[PDB]
Write a protein that binds this ligand. Sequence first.
Ligand code: NDP
Ligand code: D2B
Length: 186
Amino acid sequence: VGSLNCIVAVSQNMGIGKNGDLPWPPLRNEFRYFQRMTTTSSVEGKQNLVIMGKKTWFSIPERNRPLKGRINLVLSRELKEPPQGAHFLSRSLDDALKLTEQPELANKVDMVWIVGGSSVYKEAMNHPGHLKLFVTRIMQDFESDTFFPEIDLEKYKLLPEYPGVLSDVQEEKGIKYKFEVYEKND
Ligand SMILES: NC(=O)C1=CN([C@@H]2O[C@H](COP(=O)(O)OP(=O)(O)OC[C@H]3O[C@@H](n4cnc5c(N)ncnc54)[C@H](OP(=O)(O)O)[C@@H]3O)[C@@H](O)[C@H]2O)C=CC1
Ligand SMILES: COc1ccccc1/C(=C\c1coc2nc(N)nc(N)c12)C(C)C
């Protein structure tokens, strides 16, 4: 299995969701960036794996789901089987990561992308090892009810550029935003 990554879009006040939807109006090119980064596999014959909590899964429009061209894994202790359209279910992040090593997935999975929500990001971010964060900074405040965890910059380097990631300021619907990549290894 290849790299472990988180990907998020976050307002200036650290918001990532409101009422199960985005705090901001839809940003079409931002979403296209998310689809491209999560889908594009570095390795022939493999797909990337997306890991998400249960509320994140159900926030994807019921069409739309599963995220196409990726293996979709949902985290829940309540559910007894994967949701309609999902491929895998695990009780914990540690369990999902252990699962990628099973005969069933070990040769199928390239990159692992954690795509939300809060608690899943927090645990990934605080777990030892080599991890990257792909963070879209939405440069306005937006009312939110779910937030991105603190990024400890002692450990997460901001990289000075990254292939495939534009470095300049983007704007859609009057909303400026920019792409960043962080990397820790501990
Ligand atoms: N980039 C962005 O701006 C993103 C925004 N979002 C948004 O964030 C919100 C959803 O996020 P949030 O409210 O944090 O919820 P989560 O998606 O993380 O869902 C929480 C539920 O998932 C299950 N769960 C989460 N973590 C684990 C774990 N380690 N092990 C087992 N089960 C786990 C639990 O379910 P159970 O009770 O069944 O055990 C929990 O009640 C929505 O607003 C959505 O729009 C989501 C992703 C990215
Ligand atoms: C309601 O959000 C979605 C709607 C349709 C398809 C996927 C998403 C998700 C997340 C991101 C969307 O833009 C995104 N942008 C970035 N930089 N990271 C993210 N994690 C998302 C899922 C996982 C809930």
